[model samples]
Target chain A: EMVETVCGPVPVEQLGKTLIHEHFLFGYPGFQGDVTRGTFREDESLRVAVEAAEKMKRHGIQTVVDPTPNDCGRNPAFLRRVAEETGLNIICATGYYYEGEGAPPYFQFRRLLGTAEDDIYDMFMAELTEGIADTGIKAGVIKLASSKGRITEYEKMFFRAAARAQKETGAVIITHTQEGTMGPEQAAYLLEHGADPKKIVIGHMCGNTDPDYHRKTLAYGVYIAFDRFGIQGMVGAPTDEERVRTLLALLRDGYEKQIMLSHNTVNVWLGRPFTLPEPFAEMMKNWHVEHLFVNIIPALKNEGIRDEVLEQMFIGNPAALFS
Target chain B: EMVETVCGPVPVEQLGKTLIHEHFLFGYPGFQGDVTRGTFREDESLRVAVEAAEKMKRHGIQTVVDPTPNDCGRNPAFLRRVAEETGLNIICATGYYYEGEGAPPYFQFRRLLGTAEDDIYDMFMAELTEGIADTGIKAGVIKLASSKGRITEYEKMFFRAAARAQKETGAVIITHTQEGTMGPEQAAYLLEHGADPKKIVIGHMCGNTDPDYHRKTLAYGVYIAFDRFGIQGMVGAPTDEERVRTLLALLRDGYEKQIMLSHNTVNVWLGRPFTLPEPFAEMMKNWHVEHLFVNIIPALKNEGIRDEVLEQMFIGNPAALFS
Candidate 1:
């Protein structure tokens, strides 16, 4: 079986040590309208992303799944350039962000016109099967998201559309559940809509501290991600220490086979740069792509978690997603 | 007194026979994400707009106030090019569209972060006083809208922001009231929020056929626009015949000074163009920019509406709006 990469298609066996959720570049919706303050210098952005990609390679991460939805300034060309320069496999995504903060005006308009479903499905299918724009760069995965505590009616449309596209194209389905909320519901809806649980990854599961919440999501037989590793205390998310504790508990209970890991690092921001407050900056000190290899893995290993289980998260689970 | 055009500032006296609510180009938000079917060819779009502008000039229309909001693919440079080529005055606008069908994600996120008002004010101020991006083409007007029968809380933020910008910069405020539903309420809110009624034009007034609706809106002492002249049935808007009948009643009641006329014709659409269904196609037979001078004016003149009243709707009131 082959999975699409930013550069082209690759054998599923070639996938190794993949970071299932990371962003090379990200911008909030409507950033482009800030003509004066919002500027995207392509050469500078590419240079920074290339450096970050090379760092991932040094840490033995051969692939990264960039789940930046279309409205978040997902640039297939930029991802492909980073991959070509660093010799890393880059799997780009096709979807929209959460309805609350993401750009949904276009499809919402289509909904008002009574064609939201067909149009959304056509867009996802085209990006996955044909290519993105005229770039001939096919997306490897279908990504989607819901609001805090609920999957909105608008969001359910995207979920339904992505599920249909996933069924037809065999592309793995990944999702954003705001603050670890809606994980169980998201999984149930996708499963009920014909998505294969083996090919689904419920992301940001670490945002919730309750072990029951984790168990409830995992009971759906889908992979769960601790993707926001280095992000802590901001957006009401948990610290990496808390995340590791919960992860260890789950691992001790032998739920290691259905997990993936990554830091949702943004190597370059596509608008006016500003300094974060001292507290936020300190909270994100280790929020880089190398955080897992340099910090999380070592911490887990010192706690007596076996390398074999780690290999399943980084290698086996990701490869099996495509297979 | 002077007003900003797409090519820079011009004397208010130069704004003759202005179509106050036209659009050179219009795009719904999120049109850019449709990479496969939503192709925007700049050269072709420019050619189409230029041809439309030239035809407007032949009809003795000297200026067009293109109240395209920032999130609606507002292009200052493109408007300038059309102006330079056709020698037609193109006044651009700064603001956001109505919340329902418009793009509010970026600012909505800002509201969640507690900075929506200030950032929105800053953007409007910059586009009005300084320039749009690096083009040095200032926006001549602030355009905003509300939902049917109500101004949403999200839309009120834009109204408050725009009111501040207008107070500081002397840029006129224009608004879209979906199908003529919120004219009095929009005017009352803006006036209460410190907007000058003389500098405000409550638009799409023709969409409602009630003479009492016209009288109530005119009682606010704000210009009510008979825009969308040729657009008939789609979106439940009024037919031109009904619009003309209501307008004549208002004019006979001596409210000519408080009225403006235009077709609301979109010269070039900013995405993949498509053919309308037969019903919609027939409803828009006279929907071109030249429809006002060719059809509406002659019809009104034949009905004994004086030249001075027509001139007030076309030229005198528009100049007075800036003065």
Candidate 2:
């Protein structure tokens, strides 16, 4: 079986050392007249993205899933170009973000119309099956996001919809959870709607260090994307050190097969005047897409994480998602 | 095959006395903490739209196309209600407007990434064929718009995308033209890309009243929507009298098959504090959705336009454009 990509289907076996949950470009949906809030320079952006993809390629990563929800400016066509130019397999995401987290206005208003799960189910299935925008490139995964504390009404509707699409398509489900808001909550949402738990990846799991929360999510038999190896912006967001310690603990508990890792970096983030403002840019300098190879992997190795386990987290787990 | 509407599919024969262009609920894409923009109240907006659709029903119109482009707060789910409650067949559009006119930021940046026409084309076709956001509420037409002067690079790209989508799906192409600039140019762009000329509607043609310009557009054998019957507020917008005179002349010149009329009104606009502001609101009283039935049709009859001609102008011409 092959994994769908911007360039076309790539055999799962060839998807070596993959990085799940990353982005080539991500930003708030802005409009034409909004000068202070946009970033898109073709020549410059392509150059930067190509350079970043090359760095990941150099790090022995061969596949990257760009789970940029449409509301966050998901562009498969651009990703196709990056794949062509950088020689990396890139998978794009379909569906939307949680409301207020890059969702376009149609989302909030759709709630007013009060159609149930079926309305959303049709959307994700169309993207995965009919192919996004008919470029003949199907989305490899459906991205579902939930905010901190509690999932909003619209997010709940979206979750229900995503669940049905995953059931129909057997597509992978990567997620967004702020401040580690229980992964089990996500798994229950997906499974109750008939999605296969094995195909699910409750992302942002790296954002928390609680073994109990990790155990709760894994008990559903779903993979947990240990993405954001470098993201340490919020006081609530977990640090790389904490992430590694929790990961090792989970491995000791034998949840190794269900772990996937990535940087969750946005290589082509919009300016909003700049991609990372103030101290975060200078502060999180190691958080770029290459942070894993340049730093994290060695830390894991030094901590006695076997090469086989690294291979499983980076390669086996991700490839199994598409297969 | 039937024309798909937000309410569901309806046979073209049932799409009676349709108004070609209008907006039920549209908000500029805005974010949190942004004082200048916000979403409208659903119950409030729904009430306003239902009232407007009911009023149009009283005036003898059975169908209305709420061509609120996606970026301009297009809400298919909410529109389904207006169709249900007021029994007004509401056909929503799937596409985007140019910036300032409602083009969202993603288009501008997508250009920076040099995304393919295939990407944009596929997005629209998915909405028209499958449904918008997977709601199963298919779009009846594709909306495209150009800025006031030259079609900007992004708008030009969107026009090309719309053309390809129409070629593949046989979807109707409605447009936004400022001052009717390049109406023929817009038609030519679509035709050259294999779009059926008969299925295209160059909107805002009433924004200009030159016989020669109108002549050029009709020469394409495409319908020209004089869709601003009561839109007389803008400094350069043509008044209803000029539009009616142009219609009479076009009729005399034997181009009756190629004209559609509407007020292009927005019944429920958005702002947290206001829907429509002071001067433009009070100044454009006749600019409501019922302006054509309540005012323009009477003006056309008073000008000695025959009942058969009014039927053609109001019904026959539009019906044929779809058929």
Candidate 3:
């Protein structure tokens, strides 16, 4: 059931080993800060991303879905290049982000500025059905985000469009959570508005170390990705042990098949302004590929996690989630 | 600059006191379960409320605001009785609740529901000028709540109304936060739309024990109420110690002047099917009026919290907030 996008149809066997959430490109810091400094040049970033993908391939990683939707620095060509270089399946998405001002003109001016749903529906369908920039990489997933737990009016309209896109394209959906609290409710909201719960994935589920949070997201029958493993300390979040503990508790509570784990680590070299070297350095130290297999995996195993459960999180769960 | 409401000019001395939010004169089980049940007989409930008011007088409580708006259980006569009997100030509110099938037909059918600011202005004007039921018990505060963390289009309208009410009437705007995660953002949203940050009070801040939660809410320069003080185990909230620690931390971070505390105990009669008897019984055991002086107050005192700080919560804060 693993559906593919620009990188091509994911082989069934290859799908058995996948990372459901991994960002290929993302850098829209918006005008709130230094706008000129935040802009990322795609060609230069892609070269570095391709190199990173090669490193991921050496570790047997076969597929990566970059969930950078339109306003959130989405670049479909970058995904195609990374896929081509590393022979890894890559998927991209289409939708909006939380910060209203940072959102694209079409999102803020057109849809939010009184344009009809049909207008938004046509735009979304074009990105999902027709390839972005003439590349055959169709947007395989729909993406959405909320800010500070409050879904603005613009977000509701975006959600309605996303629901329509999912209905028409049969593409799976993923959401960027606001403080990690509204993800489940947003999923339920989308479901009530005609989106399929089974085809949705709630991102950033690892922000808060609440087991009930993990349980609630899983109970909705949507996938939950613990996708901020390494940046916990950087973002002033709890320790890595706290994250693993919460995830392990969810597994023990019988949600093993609904969880996917990733660090969402960034390795792109975007000079001094576009990206920070410290966060990236800390991520490499705390969440390297070896840390996943050697440290976090062993820690889970020692905590009574089964190999089958690990495979579900590392492989089967992601495939089923995107499928 | 304190504005007088229907409840008479709430004495400036009575203004700065703890307001346990969501107080009701009479709450029938399953408010919408039976439309007939939603219609509370004002006379019967007012008598019980009058008795409850006498109990408040003996305990030295100065004022209490019942935030049951038109959609929830707004009762003019009920609020009048409590105000008249105990000589304690009573604040009534007017605003829409979350949209449900049972919501008012006006809200459901009306295409142009008018601006929330207009609705809020009318409510505040009526309370300030005419008094509720002509008993002169004015709506001393504006109350608004969101359903789940996702603020519906209608609720956003109400938020705008609450903000405008505060701006025009100089009344404190109290908000019912759903899932506790929306308080900071909800406050920010309202502020962005013209609500004065200093005039807002975010209720239910104790639902989640996230430290950043207290920091974030306080950062808005608005009041934060740990109103559900005594009902811990029932709501699955933090223990008294945890609540005190978080509150004290907020105080240490220069937010002592913006804190208010209350039990928020609602007495449910034995036959009330949807209401739990334990919350009432727990209040009797744990929150007997002096629990403030004995438990919470003492805890704050032991943490080096001064009487001046106590007055901010018990007196200064609430007066400045609602005034």
Measured by lDDT, the strongest candidate is 1
Q: Which ten residues in a row have the lowest lDDT in candidate 1 chain A?
A: A269-278
Number of the candidate with higher lDDT, 1 or 2: 1
Q: What is the C-alpha RMSD of each candidate to the true structure, in Å?
A: 2.6, 16.2, 21.4
Cα displacement (angstroms), candidate 1, residue B224, comes to 2.3
Find the 10 residues in a row with the least total lDDT in model 3 chain B.
B28-37
The CA lDDT at B105 in model 1 is 69
Q: Best to worst by DockQ, what's the order?
A: 1, 2, 3
**What pairs collide in candidate 2?**
A30-B105, A31-B105, A123-B134, A133-B122, A133-B123, A134-B122, A271-A274
lDDT of 3 by residue, A122-188 (tens): 6567767775545566777877877666877767777888888888888888887766678778878
| Ranking of candidates on lDDT, top first | 1, 2, 3
lDDT of 1 at A66: 96
DockQ of every model listed? 0.51, 0.07, 0.01
Model 2 preserves the real interface contacts to a fraction of: 0.13
TM-score of each: 0.92, 0.55, 0.47
Where does model 1 exceed 4 Å of error? A233-236, A277-286, B210-214, B275-286
